[PDB]
Design a protein around this ligand. Structure first.
Ligand SMILES: CCCCCCCCCCCC(=O)OC(CO)CO
Length: 138
């Protein structure tokens, strides 16, 4: 079930989100708020079609894609840049390459049991996040 990323995932850890945001040139006042925020990931996955929402108390980031289909991603509410994005499977890891102004920009997202791992990369900065599958009703 390592390819099934469906559901709601609640952030457990967030390492070096500051460096990732700084590499994206996000302004200092925004980073000061954003580094503290818990995030939630909501994934609606139907085969290779993904609809994703990353939410917080401050701002949300939405991106939808089909595995294997390059798309024009506009990173609204993050750094507000246009990139050419492609998501593919490398094994059971979902890998996105975002070609554009910033070198070495992309992300890798994968399941281990009840945990979702996400590594966000830009240039020489890597942010490593872990989310836990939302607790089901009592
Ligand atoms: C500056 C305010 C930040 C507000 C929180 C929003 C942060 C989003 C970070 C990028 C997440 C991302 O691209 O993740 C992909 C894989 O999960 C989306 O499919």
């Amino acid at each position: 079930m390592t390819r099934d990323q469906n559901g709601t995932w609640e952030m457990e850890s967030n390492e070096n989100f500051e460096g990732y945001m700084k590499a994206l040139d996000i302004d200092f006042a925004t980073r000061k708020i954003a580094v503290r925020l818990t995030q939630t990931k909501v994934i609606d996955q139907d085969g290779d079609n993904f609809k994703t929402k990353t939410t917080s108390t401050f701002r949300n980031y939405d991106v939808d894609f089909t595995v294997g289909v390059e798309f024009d991603e506009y990173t609204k509410s993050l750094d507000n840049r246009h990139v050419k994005a492609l998501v593919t499977w490398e094994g059971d890891v979902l890998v996105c390459v975002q070609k554009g102004e910033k070198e070495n920009r992309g992300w890798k997202q994968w399941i281990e049991g009840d945990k979702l791992y996400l590594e966000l990369t830009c240039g020489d900065q890597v942010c490593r996040q872990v989310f836990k599958k939302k607790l089901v009703p009592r």
